Structures are given as C-alpha cells and as structure tokens.
Design a protein around this ligand. Structure first.
Ligand code: MGD
Ligand code: MGD
Ligand code: SF4
Ligand code: SF4
Ligand code: SF4
Ligand code: SF4
Ligand code: H2S
Ligand code: W
Lengths: 214, 967
C-alpha cells in the first residue's frame, strides 16, 4: 500500500496544502472570522478535509516553539471508522487494497454519523448537516492510482509532505527521525505501525493537537 | 484516466504573485476553447518542482472568479453609479482626455529655455504585475506622449536599496538566484520574512540546512521563518547598521576576511585622498547649513593616468581596508548588544557562524527583501551587507551573494523596462534639460584608463542609439533624441517620484492619473489624504482585474460622490493565465508563459488595452494636429502587432533587437532583419535596434531562449543548479553575477566542489563568465568604473562607509557611536497620545493591498480580517484579551482590528524603558470582503523620507485601545 511521511520539523505553515486540497476537489470556503489566531478554518468540517493547526509554546530565551499540524485522515491499516459503519451498512466505508486508502462512499448517509466519528481515535470524520454524508481526506486516491502525488504532497515546498510505498516511507521516517532528534530530542513518529499518515512530531504530539495520536 | 483533466489542454505558466517565479500547469476545457478547470504546480520546473504556496495554489480561484471585471465601466463627474460601456467608447473618450490635457499642458521648453518636450499634467502608477513586453510598450507609450511622472511598485521597496548594490558591485540586481541558496553554508535572513513572502525559497534554504548550513533569522518579530531557522535573534526596529557594523568589526579584528579575494577583487588596496576624514559622526566636506556633503573630499588619490593609486600590500594607512578598520573599531559587542537588544552571547554566536564563511571552502548568503530599509540610511544598511560579503569573499560564488529578494513577479522586469521617472529601459538615464544633444548625453558616462577595468558602461552609446532606433527606426538617433521628454536639471530628482506625485495631486497639479495595475487608495501611505487627493483629478484610468478601492474611491468611507468631479474609466484586464509573454523573477530569469483559457468575458491583455488606447490618440492627432505630434506619429508600433493584436513574440524580438542593414560587428557579418545574438554586437551608428540592451541574447535566430524548458546540465552546472538551458537570464545567461570573483588569477575556483566558472582548455566552463578575458587580465566587477567591489563607496549621499544614524525618531535620544543622533543629510511630531511603534508587514496567504487575494475565498478563509499583533506585556498594560476588537489610531487616522496577543512580539528595551511594537497587515480594504476591515495605511504618515522619497510604513507612532462590547 501507500503512505505519507509528514516531517513537521520542516513545516513553514505556508498552508499551500490547505488551499491545494480545496482547489483539486473544488471544495467551498467556510465563513470564518479572526478569533485571535492565524488558524482558519478553526476545525475540519464537511467542506474542509485539512486545516493547519497553530499552537504557540513558550521556551527559555527569545521567540517561541511554534507548532504547525496539517491535520488529515490517518488512513489507518485497521480503520475503526469502517468497523463502526459496517454495524449499520457495509459499503459505507471501504478499503482500496492497492493503495490502502480508507474511503467514505455516499452510503455514509445511511449509517450513524456521530457513532463513526466517535469510533475514530483521531476525531477525523465530519457530517454534512444537509445530506448526513460523512467527509474526510480520501488520500487523493484517484490522483495516486493515475501516477500523481496527492495535491497537498505535490504543493508542499519544504519537504514536510512525502508520499510513496509504505516500505520506502517507513524507512525514510526512521532515517529522518534519527537526524531530526539531534536538533529536537523529543522527536517521535505518530503511531507508525497503525497508520498510513506517519507524522514526525518535534515534541509531545499532544502539544500539536489533543488528537495528534490515539 | 483523471476525469477532471480529461479533454482539457495542458499549458505552462508562471505564478502571477511573488518574484520566486514558480512554474504552473494550467488545464483548459474543450482542448483550450473553454475555461480553466485546474491550476497547480509544474512538476518539471527546476525552482518549485511542482510546489506552490497558497497564493500560487489558488490561481484557479483568481481566474475563474465571477467577481472579476467583465467590461469597461464609466463614472461621470459627480455620478454615484458606474455605467457599463464598450471598449470602442472607453478608449475613444480616454484618447480625447489624453490629447486635451497634453495640448493644454505640453511645454516645448522650460523656464530656462532648454528643450524639454514634456507634459506635467498627467501621471502614471504601475505596474510590476504586467508582462515584460507590456511594461516595455507601456513606458514607451507614456514617454512618446511626453510623460516624466512614470512610477510603480519598485520605488517603494527596491529603489531605496538598489543604489547600495550598484555602488558596491556595479549592478542593482539580486547577485545569485533561488536554486543557488541550497549551496550556502550559512544563510542570514535579515529584513526578510522569506518563509511567508517568498515561500518556495525555503525548499532551497532547508536543502542548504540538510547539507550542514546554519539558518539565522534576525527580526524584531518571531515569524513562520523564525520557526524553521537554527538561530532566531531579535533586533530592535532600526538597529540593523549597529548589528552589521559589529559584524564588520568582528571580521576585521579576528582576521576572518579572505585576504586573497579582498586584495585583488575589492577596492581594499585603493589609496583614499588626504581630504577624507570622519569625526563626531560627520565625514569631511559637510555643509552644516545645507545638510549635504562635498563628495570630492572623499576622492581617491589618482596616479599620472587618473587611475586610483593602489598599495597591493594593504599597509598604506590611507588604504581603504585600514580606514575601514579605523571606522568600525567603535562597534564593540557591548554597544551593539545595548542598541540592538540582542544579547552579547547571541551576537557572538551569529558573528562566529557567519564570519566562518570567510574560508574559501565555505559560502555565506544574506537574504533581505524590504524589512525596514525604506528610511534615509536603508541604502547604508544594504551597503554594510555588501561590504561584509566582499570581506568574506562571498560575492560571485555558489551559495554566496546579496540575495536582495524582489517583491512582485515582474518588479525586476518593470524596473528593467524603465517604469521609473529617472530611467529609460536598460537603466539608461532619462535625460535632464542640460543634456541638450545625444553627444552631451553620452559624455556623462565615466571612463577608466586602467587596462584591466572592463568598464562595460562605455558601450552605453550603442544601447541608447539602438533603443532610439527601436522607437524611431526611420530617424537618426541624434534626431530621435529630441522626441523624448526631459526632466529639469535644477529640480530635485525625488520631485518626479511616487510620493511627490501624491503631493502634486493633493495640490491639484494633476488633471489625469493612470492607476494601471496598482491600488494606490490602499498601497499609498496616509490613505485618508491620498483618497481625498484623487478627488482633485479631472480624470482617472484604472486598469485592473476587479473593481477596487482606487477605481471606486469616489464612493469609499466618508466620501460624497455628488461633490467628487473625477471622471473614472475602469478597464478590466485579463489574469496571467489568459495571456502569453514573459516575467523576470528575482534571479533575473526571464520566463515565457502561454495562454490557457481565452480572456474572461470582455477583459483584455494590458498590451491590447494600451496599444488600442495609443492607436486612438494617434488617429486623433493625425486628423486635428495639436502639440508636437512627431513623437506619437513616428513611434514604431508595427513591430508590436500581429493579426490585429498586441504580439508578445514580436515585441520580445524588438526588445532583443535586430540588424536594420548588413553589418560587420565583433569581426563577423550580420544580415538585415537578423536577430542581435547579444548586446556585444549592438552599434551606435544606427545599424542595430534593441528596445532593451539587457534583452539582447534573449530572443536570437536560435529562437525564444526565455521559452527554453531544458534541464540539460553538465556535472559542474548540476552540482550548484545553474539550469542554464531553462529559460534565459540577463545578462547573456550569467546566472551568478560577478562570477570572475569565484576564481583565482589562474582561473581556478576558490571552492572547486562548488565551482561557478573554471578556466579549462582556454575556455571558461560552468556559468557564462561575467566579463570576457583570460584569467588575471580583468578586474571582476565589469560594470564598475574602476572594476572593484567597493568597501569604500564615495557616491553615497550619507558617506563612503555605513554609519549608525537613528531611524526611530520618537523613542530614542542617544547614539552610542557618535554625537550625531539622526542622519545629517536628511519633522515627526511624536505626540505622546501615540506611544507605541506601529509597523506593517505581510502574511503568506494575502498579496499586497489584498485587491487580488480578498477576492479568493480560500485565502479569505485562512485570513479573513485585519488583525493587530501585540505582546502579552502590552495586552496586560491596555487590558486587551486575545480575540478582542481594538481601535488602532495615529495622527493620520484610525481603524478596528482583531487583537492577536502573542510572545512572538516582545517589548524593546530603549534607554531603560519598555517600548511596545504593534503589528498590522496592510492586506485589507473597505471594498471586500465584508468585515475584512480597511488598509493599515489609514494610520501611516505620507511625511516622506527627505533622501529616498519613500514614506514610513515600518515604524509610525500609534495608540491601541480595547473597543468595549456589551457585558
Ligand atoms: N505572502 C506575501 N508575499 C509577498 C508579498 C505579499 O503581500 N504577501 N509582497 C511582496 C512584495 S511587493 C515585497 S516588496 C516583498 C517584501 O518582503 P519582506 O521584506 O519579507 O516583507 P515584510 O513582511 O513587510 O517585512 C519583512 C520582515 O522585516 C521585519 N522588520 C521590520 N522592521 C525591521 C527592522 O528594523 N530590521 C529588521 N532586520 N527587520 C525588520 C518585519 O518584522 C518582517 O518580518 O514581499 C513580497 N512577497
Ligand atoms: N503599509 C504598507 N504599505 C505598503 C507596503 C507595506 O509593506 N506596508 N508595501 C509597499 C510595496 S513593497 C508595494 S510593491 C506596494 C504595492 O501596491 P500595489 O501595487 O498598489 O498593490 P496591489 O494593487 O494590491 O498590487 C497588485 C495589483 O496588480 C494587479 N494585477 C494583477 N495582474 C495584473 C495584470 O495582468 N495586469 C494589470 N494591469 N494589473 C494586474 C492586481 O489586480 C492588483 O491591483 O505597496 C506598498 N505599500
Ligand atoms: S504545504 Fe508543506 S510547509 Fe506548507 S503548511 Fe502544508 S505541510 Fe507545511
Ligand atoms: S483516521 Fe479516523 S476516519 Fe481516517 S481511517 Fe482512521 S479511523 Fe477512519
Ligand atoms: S491527500 Fe488529497 S484529500 Fe487528503 S489532505 Fe491531501 S489533498 Fe486533501
Ligand atoms: S507566490 Fe511566490 S512562492 Fe508562492 S507559488 Fe507564487 S511564485 Fe511561488
Ligand atoms: S515590489
Ligand atoms: W514591493
């Protein structure tokens, strides 16, 4: 299958990835306002599959530890969302056996929306008030199957976003974690044996977001 | 198959935002006959490799946008409503407005009786957003009409600093290029927020880090750039010269300068005359009454031939290097730490890390953009960077340079095309009234008797002749010379520039303004004054993508349309992906892009708008006559046209230039009609035309070199990423300027592992050599009169060495380096009701005044409203909570913003007092979106910098007060 390696030690929070996701799928913009943060949209929603979360942490000496987290579906090897959806209707949540993508179909409207979201340990699924369809990151599965990188990966200027076969990406993640640890001693990979979106966090993943890891 | 892209034609483009010059792929429905369906990164482009920041990434949303202008709008005097009109109508009435104002105002001769042939009743603003061919055509249309008040973006951010690089190296351009950053061993980012403002630059910056480079950010604020650097050093606003002066002292004291490089390639060895001195903060030749220097007191000691004398031993006490040592002894760590607010420990860390690049096998680069360099000593700030780079042997080398980051996608090109009052295309000066003949004009160019000094500007007569032969090919250059307008020799140069155009407008001295691809109602400092001032225009032509604060100033906040007599034409132009042409990026890469979809609705490329508008002025002069018609009627516009339309291809071939008859030049034969293969084969005798000598080599008989998409590289090219077969850069595809300085006198690289050029088998291999000649036979700075990198720069108004003069007027009373507090060559009120230092800056997601990005829902989504960034200390002082509405006020105006309370802003320690800085984005305007807010330029003074003629947008006094809501 396929895998993202997301090296958050390289992220400039440019939000190219946030825009690129909406442009490829032609998603609408939310109504947003500034509530004392650069972060916006403030959360994932039916029309927002990825938002970059900003957290400021004090450090001794000048400046801050500014933590950026471009949030997206982890495309879990064994997705709980599927297990929950399969209680109400099989075919609502499916697994692409070629890429490993976890995919919501139009039949998510026929399952319990709250239940499937509750089952996700990363709190990823979002419900349309109108149709009751569930939405999330689909790994740009169509692009991937046609040779192309996911939109958010291709757009990323810093080398934060990496995509490929799970063998080369796990190997990159382990090699890169060893190198990043020299500058950031508390650097860890996010649930690397359980997910296809493997984040390198520069410190306690929970500092980036409360649902950064399961 | 991907359904979205099925049946869509793929074309290439270049991002229409910042000067990185990222490649795009555009998909257009119906195999090109329809609308764009997709815009994303070009995976094959060597700069971005398919990456885009959110601005590039959202260009689909900019183009396929139902808020865009569809057709010309007309506003009649005192009207409170637009009236849709035809192109034929709007351009007819505009052509009658031009001629009417020109005929009434044209002056064949000034008060002193000198030939001038100009009109001072019309001004033009813009634009760095236009294609190079459209910039070159536009400037020449305005000048043929006799305008002298021709300005754009470049004046505000770039013009204040360019002279620092011209003085130092001989050219004003960014010395290296984006890919080259990956070869640097130490990257100093200072007066730049490149992660936000040149985002794809960080691909290459972080690649430098991957190969062991130290990344250093020196900034009053902690930004998205700071987050990804190894070292963040806070600096107090305006303390850059102390910081850099300390680094110079450190380099000199510790012998960390590259002696071999410094001895041969800088003016370190030149003997300064006895008349030079510095004491109590003043250079010799100071006229206290007129606050001005007699620069002849700074002259070099000259030998029998008029060549500056040299001590190659560097022992003579009046050697530049020994005077430099003496000047910078005062800049000790304690005083620099005290004024900068940077800890002594951090100063040492940065100094050690950066000065380590003095070693031949190490390269350091400095990235700066605008920062705070707009003030009177901004030029000296950059001078200091240039001097540090010359001491450490970092000029001409891979991973070195002064990377002066350009702002807009084509601000490099729009400057190159002479859309500033003082220059023609190719940096040939606009003649003044005393330059009464072409012979007199050419006499001004300085000569050198040094046999090793290339002094390439001696070729100027070939470029001026060829440029006059491009505009008027039936006339002898000397005759053509009289057609183009001249400025008053006696008048102060800044009287013709951006800020005095706003002063003249507010005095009612302008009948007509072209706001062509600019939003002055938001972009100009002191917006309340400028918005009023536009009311005093009789007419205004706005050429833009959207209705905006400029087009519609007459119905803005507190405006009564009934009282406002200005006649406004709004002419909607097409977005970048709807037209063909070139844009010159920060690295001088002149990149060809193609039409994706046809222009939206009835929008037009700028080239068609300007050409049709001119053609109508022409018709109207041929059938009525009027003021001096000769310049209009004889202007060669036939070379600008194909199939009844503006031809980017034909204009680009003219700007390159062609032979007007069979010619022997450089010992080779060239046929009539044939393309000039390089500016080296241009002539003064009218054998050649060329609209811009810098473009000679860009479009040859081999074809359009700007359109090359060839990644072919030799190993030595690929090792530093020159990509010489990808597009074309002026001059003659020299990717790294001053590259002769990268080798010793045998032509061997200082750093072979990062060679730029190398002498092999009687040839320079690698980059194109910046100046022909065997190794050790030429001085490496070929555009300098004397041929050296200038550590000592006697052409600078404030002195030949940078000196700390306090740019922060209000909170500072003491200068620790001399008795001279403020710039002795340069009226702030400092009202106590406004105790905070207001500053304006950018975020990644918005572009300029936000006219473009406030129309893109995904960018508004991310950054929906004007905000005010403040420290916890100022928050605690003014009782402001995060997310509270605040009122920000100055003597010039007031606005509301959302408070962002952050440790990313800290108080400055100034003379035992906490001084608070308040940050605002200038990306907002009353037009759009709803609850976006207005321009931060309501707050800023128009009170201009005496020297540069640019106002203060980086340090202006404000107050911040909580706006109370209901409990
Ligand atoms: N996203 C985005 N990118 C842009 C633009 C845009 O609007 N949006 N505009 C483009 C244009 S036209 C231009 S000219 C460039 C300008 O590019 P920059 O010069 O990078 O732009 P700013 O953010 O205005 O200022 C840069 C930094 O200078 C710092 N600074 C302020 N005062 C001082 C001082 O006294 N000393 C030092 N050392 N630093 C100081 C500010 O805190 C800020 O972080 O950006 C270009 N790129
Ligand atoms: N307070 C404050 N003020 C500042 C600055 C600051 O840092 N602080 N920065 C200054 C700087 S560095 C600059 S460069 C200026 C910029 O000031 P302006 O140039 O007035 O700003 P915009 O109009 O937003 O710049 C982009 C314009 O280009 C237009 N455009 C895009 N494509 C085309 C095209 O194909 N044709 C035409 N004709 N127009 C096109 C857009 O629609 C838009 O009007 O602002 C300056 N003002
Ligand atoms: S595109 Fe890359 S650098 Fe930019 S915010 Fe997304 S992950 Fe971070
Ligand atoms: S992250 Fe949540 S929604 Fe995505 S695959 Fe895992 S359980 Fe399902
Ligand atoms: S992989 Fe595709 S769907 Fe998922 S966040 Fe990236 S762009 Fe959006
Ligand atoms: S705005 Fe600049 S960095 Fe961003 S995509 Fe455009 S050219 Fe590249
Ligand atoms: S600019
Ligand atoms: W600019």
């Amino acid at each position: 299958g396929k895998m993202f390696f997301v090296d958050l030690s390289r992220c400039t929070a440019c939000r190219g990835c946030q825009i690129a996701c909406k442009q490829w799928k032609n998603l609408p913009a939310e109504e947003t306002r500034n509530t004392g943060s650069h972060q916006n949209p403030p959360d994932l929603s039916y029309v927002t599959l990825k938002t970059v979360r900003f957290t400021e942490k004090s450090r001794k000496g000048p400046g801050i530890d500014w933590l950026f987290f471009p949030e997206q579906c982890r495309h879990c090897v064994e997705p709980p969302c599927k297990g929950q959806a399969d209680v109400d209707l099989e075919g609502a949540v499916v697994k692409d056996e070629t890429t490993g993508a976890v995919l919501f179909t139009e039949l998510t409207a026929k399952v319990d929306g709250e239940s499937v979201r509750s089952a996700c340990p990363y709190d990823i699924p979002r419900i349309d008030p109108v149709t009751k369809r569930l939405s999330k990151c689909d790994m740009c599965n169509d692009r991937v199957q046609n040779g192309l990188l996911p939109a958010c990966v291709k757009t990323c200027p810093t080398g934060t976003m990496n995509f490929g076969d799970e063998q080369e990406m796990l190997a990159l993640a382990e090699k890169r974690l060893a190198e990043v640890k020299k500058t950031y001693p508390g650097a860890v990979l996010g649930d690397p044996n359980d997910v296809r979106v493997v984040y390198l966090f520069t410190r306690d993943p929970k500092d980036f977001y409360e649902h950064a890891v399961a | 198959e991907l359904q979205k892209l099925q049946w869509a034609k793929q074309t290439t483009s270049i991002c229409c935002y910042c000067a990185v010059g990222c490649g795009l792929i555009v998909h257009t429905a119906k195999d090109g006959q329809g609308r764009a369906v997709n815009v994303e990164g070009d995976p094959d482009h060597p700069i971005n490799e398919g990456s885009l920041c959110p601005k590039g990434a959202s260009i689909f949303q900019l183009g396929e946008n139902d808020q865009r202008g569809t057709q010309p709008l007309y506003r009649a005097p005192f009207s409170d409503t637009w009236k849709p009109v035809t192109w034929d109508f709007a351009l007819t009435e505009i052509a009658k407005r031009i001629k009417k104002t020109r005929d009434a105002s044209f002056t064949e001769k000034n008060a002193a009786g000198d030939l001038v042939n100009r009109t001072e009743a019309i001004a033009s603003f813009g634009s760095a957003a236009m294609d190079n061919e459209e910039c070159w055509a536009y400037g020449n249309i305005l000048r043929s009409l006799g305008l002298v008040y021709i300005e754009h973006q470049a004046r505000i951010x770039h013009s204040p600093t360019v002279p620092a690089l011209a003085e130092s190296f001989g050219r004003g351009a960014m010395t290296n290029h984006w890919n080259d950053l990956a070869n640097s061993d130490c990257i100093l980012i200072m007066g730049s927020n490149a992660a936000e403002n040149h985002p794809i630059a960080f691909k290459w910056v972080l690649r430098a880090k991957d190969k062991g480079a130290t990344l250093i950010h020196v900034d009053p604020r902690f930004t998205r750039t700071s987050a990804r650097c190894d070292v963040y050093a806070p600096i107090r606003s305006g303390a850059d010269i102390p910081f850099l002066g300390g680094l110079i002292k450190y380099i000199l004291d510790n012998k960390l300068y590259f002696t071999d490089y410094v001895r041969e390639y800088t003016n370190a060895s030149l003997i300064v005359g006895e008349k030079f001195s510095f004491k109590d903060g003043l250079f010799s030749g100071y006229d206290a009454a007129n606050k001005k220097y007699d620069k002849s007191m700074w002259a070099f000691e000259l030998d029998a031939n008029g060549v500056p004398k040299r001590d190659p031993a560097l022992k003579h006490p009046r050697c530049v290097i020994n005077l430099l040592k003496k000047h910078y002894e005062r800049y000790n760590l304690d005083k620099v730490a005290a004024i900068t607010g940077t800890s002594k420990e951090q100063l040492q860390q940065v100094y050690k890390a950066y000065a380590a690049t003095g070693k031949p096998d190490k390269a350091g680069t400095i990235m700066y953009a605008m920062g705070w360099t707009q003030h009177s000593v901004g030029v000296q700030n950059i001078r200091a960077m240039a001097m540090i780079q010359l001491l450490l042997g970092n000029i001409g080398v891979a991973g070195g340079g002064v990377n002066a980051l350009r702002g807009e996608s084509n601000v490099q090109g729009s400057t190159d095309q002479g859309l500033l009052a003082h220059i023609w295309p190719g940096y040939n000066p606009v003649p003044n009234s005393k330059a009464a003949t072409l012979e007199l004009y050419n006499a001004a160019t300085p000569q050198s008797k040094d046999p090793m000094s290339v002094n390439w500007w001696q070729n100027r007569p070939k470029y001026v002749a060829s440029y006059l032969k491009a505009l008027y090919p039936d006339e002898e250059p000397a005759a053509a010379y009289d057609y183009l307008p001249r400025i008053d020799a006696g008048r102060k140069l800044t009287d013709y520039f951006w800020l005095n155009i706003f002063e003249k407008m507010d005095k009612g001295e302008f009948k007509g303004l072209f706001a062509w691809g600019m939003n002055p109602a938001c972009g100009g400092a002191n917006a309340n004054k400028n918005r009023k001032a536009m009311g005093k225009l009789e007419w205004l032509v706005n050429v833009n993508l959207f209705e905006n604060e400029t087009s519609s100033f007459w119905k803005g906040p507190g405006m009564n349309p009934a009282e406002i007599g200005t006649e406004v034409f709004f002419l909607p132009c097409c977005v970048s992906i709807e037209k063909e042409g070139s844009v010159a990026n920060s690295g001088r890469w002149m990149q060809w892009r193609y039409r994706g979809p046809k222009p939206y609705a009835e929008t037009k490329p700028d080239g068609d708008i300007m050409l049709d508008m001119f053609k109508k002025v022409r018709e109207l002069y041929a059938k009525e006559g009027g003021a001096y018609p000769a310049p209009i009627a004889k202007l060669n516009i036939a070379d600008w046209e194909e199939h009844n339309e503006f031809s980017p291809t034909k204009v680009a071939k003219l700007m390159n230039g062609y032979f007007l008859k069979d010619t022997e030049v450089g010992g080779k034969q060239f046929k009539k009609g044939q393309q000039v293969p390089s500016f080296a084969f241009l002539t003064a005798d009218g054998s050649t035309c060329s609209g811009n000598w810098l473009h000679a080599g860009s479009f040859t008989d081999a074809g359009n070199l700007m359109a090359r998409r060839d990644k072919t590289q030799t190993p030595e090219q690929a090792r530093i990423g020159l990509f010489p077969n990808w597009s074309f850069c002026w001059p003659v595809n020299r990717r790294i300027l001053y590259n002769r300085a990268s080798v010793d006198k045998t032509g061997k690289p200082w750093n072979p592992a990062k060679a730029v050029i190398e002498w092999k088998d009687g040839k320079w291999v690698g980059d194109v050599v910046d100046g022909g000649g065997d190794p050790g036979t030429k001085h490496p700075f070929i555009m300098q009169t004397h041929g050296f990198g200038a550590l000592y720069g006697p052409g600078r108004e404030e002195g030949p060495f940078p000196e700390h003069y306090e740019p922060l007027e209000c909170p500072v009373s003491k200068n620790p380096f001399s008795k001279q507090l403020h710039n002795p060559v340069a009226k702030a009120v400092c009202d106590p009701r406004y105790p905070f230092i207001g500053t304006t800056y950018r975020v990644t997601e918005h572009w300029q005044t936000g006219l473009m990005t406030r129309r893109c829902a995904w960018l508004v989504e991310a950054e929906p409203q004007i905000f005010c960034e403040i420290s916890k200390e100022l928050a605690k002082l003014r009782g402001i909570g995060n997310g509270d509405t605040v009122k920000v006020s100055s003597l010039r105006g007031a606005l509301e913003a959302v408070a962002i309370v952050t440790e990313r802003i800290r108080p400055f320690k100034i003379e035992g007092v906490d001084v608070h800085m308040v940050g605002l984005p200038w990306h907002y305007g009353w037009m759009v979106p709803k609850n976006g807010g207005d321009t931060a330029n309501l707050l800023t003074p128009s009170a201009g910098d005496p020297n540069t003629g640019i106002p203060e947008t980086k340090a202006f006094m404000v107050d911040v007060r909580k706006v109370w809501s209901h409990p």
